[PDB]
Design an enzyme around this catalytic site. Sequence first.
Site, short mmCIF file in Angstrom:
data_model
loop_
_atom_site.label_atom_id
_atom_site.label_comp_id
_atom_site.label_asym_id
_atom_site.label_seq_id
_atom_site.Cartn_x
_atom_site.Cartn_y
_atom_site.Cartn_z
N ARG A 173 1.13 -11.91 -4.55
CA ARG A 173 2.51 -12.35 -4.38
C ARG A 173 2.65 -13.85 -4.63
O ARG A 173 3.54 -14.29 -5.37
CB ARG A 173 3.01 -12.00 -2.98
CG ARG A 173 3.13 -10.50 -2.72
CD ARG A 173 3.13 -10.20 -1.23
NE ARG A 173 3.12 -8.77 -0.96
CZ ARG A 173 3.07 -8.24 0.26
NH1 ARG A 173 3.02 -8.99 1.34
NH2 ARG A 173 3.08 -6.91 0.39
N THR A 176 -4.69 -2.74 8.00
CA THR A 176 -4.99 -4.10 7.57
C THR A 176 -6.45 -4.44 7.82
O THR A 176 -7.11 -5.05 6.98
CB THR A 176 -4.08 -5.09 8.30
OG1 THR A 176 -4.47 -5.18 9.67
CG2 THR A 176 -2.63 -4.64 8.22
N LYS A 186 0.82 -1.21 0.00
CA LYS A 186 0.00 0.00 0.00
C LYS A 186 0.85 1.27 0.00
O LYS A 186 0.43 2.29 -0.54
CB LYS A 186 -0.95 -0.02 1.20
CG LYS A 186 -1.75 1.25 1.40
CD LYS A 186 -2.68 1.51 0.23
CE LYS A 186 -3.49 2.78 0.44
NZ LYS A 186 -2.62 4.00 0.44
N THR A 187 2.05 1.21 0.58
CA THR A 187 2.94 2.37 0.58
C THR A 187 3.32 2.77 -0.84
O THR A 187 3.39 3.96 -1.17
CB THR A 187 4.19 2.09 1.40
OG1 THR A 187 4.88 0.95 0.85
CG2 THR A 187 3.82 1.79 2.85
N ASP A 227 -0.33 4.31 8.90
CA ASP A 227 -0.56 2.88 8.98
C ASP A 227 -0.62 2.46 10.45
O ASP A 227 -0.10 3.15 11.32
CB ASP A 227 0.54 2.10 8.25
CG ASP A 227 0.18 0.64 8.04
OD1 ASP A 227 -0.67 0.35 7.17
OD2 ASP A 227 0.75 -0.22 8.74
#
Length: 309
Positions: free
Chosen positions: A197, A138, A48-49, A93
Amino acid sequence: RAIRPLKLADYIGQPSVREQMELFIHAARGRQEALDHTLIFGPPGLGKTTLANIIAQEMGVSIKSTSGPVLERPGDLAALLTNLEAGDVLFVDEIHRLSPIVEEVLYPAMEDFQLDIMIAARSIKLDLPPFTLVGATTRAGMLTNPLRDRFGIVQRLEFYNVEDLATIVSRSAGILGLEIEPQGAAEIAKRARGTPRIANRLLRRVRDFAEVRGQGDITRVIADKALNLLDVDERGFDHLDRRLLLTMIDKFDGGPVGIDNLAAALSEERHTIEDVLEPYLIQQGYIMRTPRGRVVTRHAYLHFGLNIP
DNA sequence: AAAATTAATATTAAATATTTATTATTATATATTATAATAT
């Protein structure tokens, strides 16, 4: 050399959500104002960064990618806000883990961009430049009700659509240089497991399979030969998962089970199971959960022709 | 008798700045306590 689309239109995977957030980006650009607070939640690990950085280049301003340990003290976040300027933005975050003192400091920070602080009590009022506070967690369920209700934009992140997962597989295989097939793309989309991923890992492994078993060719038959033996299944099952299902149903016949008993009987500690294997199957819903034992649902009974009590 | 004064007169000796066991007091998982429904 991470996988990353350059632009928001180049971002593919959530087309309706991408169009919605593109609308928000153009709303920020046209109005010549800082964009509203955007709440982001969904999968835990998705980079997300990097997406916030892409949004930063779309704004053309700097976004300080910050997290819970970065902003656990109100002084650090206050200093970062003081170095923040007009039209800037701050990625935040682990808001859920943050202390409520951070929450009360950030109440006036987004509430028309001010700051009120106490010093026999004396009050000191401070101002802040307009900016775009970015809150990404999250899980957003731990966010307090007045704080989340006072926010503006709420955006949801999720695993991509199966056809759109297949397109992402095709694009990543083109990036990886694999001679992939659209049937193979849909295959790996069915194997995408809801995670980009592990999906890209599967692309790499089927590329290795095509290199060592075929002549550098990825087809539907090649993908089937690569992903129809061992811990694989078209839906997402593993032979670990099949072993767990069989060992539950032959012992307790789809009844209440003891988790310590299951860990002992499977020669496999329950921790890893409930960390990777159980959460995915309950994400598919195929295991119904009780405080007296985990039982698979009617889908697994239909998978093996089993009755319903 | 009964307390206050004073001149001998023998007596006594000066150690600080530091240091380490010896007590305070602050988290952090983890082997406990617990409940609920559940067959028999």
